[PDB]
Amino acid sequence: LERIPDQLGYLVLSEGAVLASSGDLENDEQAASAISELVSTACGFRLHRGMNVPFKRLSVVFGEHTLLVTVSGQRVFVVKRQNR
Amino acid sequence: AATLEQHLEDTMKNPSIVGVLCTDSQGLNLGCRGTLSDEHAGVISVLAQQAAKLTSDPTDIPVVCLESDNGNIMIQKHDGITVAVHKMA
């Protein structure tokens, strides 16, 4: 079975605050604020259908890790994942 | 950064790429094709800028990807030029 890369931290936001966090993301107010802003913009973004958030996942890919962000609907779920 | 019209055209040649757009830190629509146009340029510029705040770069400039069932929009800054590409799956 396929090898899934390690998680490096989680963050759950429930506007505006940190509801839960662990690992690299634990009590990191700056990251939580910056994610919250990115997510609000991404959520407000429309391609060609007003009644459609044009993503099911937002991923921010860095050299060694990626932040995987899902929204529903006033909460934000973040996993920091090692790259494959 | 130098000319960029040629790159927009070559990129669109890919049969899954349905849109491309370049902006800067200001949100200037520096050229777009296909599915991405003026009303998208601003939000695209803001996203890249907001995503950059998620690191104090090890020279680690992120790619922002908005993933949908049908395709993806991939956004990266390089350099002072922000390039968004709309791909079908």
Numbering used by the authors:
A (entry chain A): 9 to 92
B (entry chain B): 2 to 90
Provide passages from the article that reported this PDB entry:
α3-helix feature which are present in Lamtor2 and Lamtor3. between their α2-helices as well as β3 and β4 strands.
and the human pentameric Ragulator complex. RagB, promoting their GTP binding in exchange of GDP. the Rag GTPases, thus mTORC1 can be activated by the lysosome-located small GTPase Rheb.
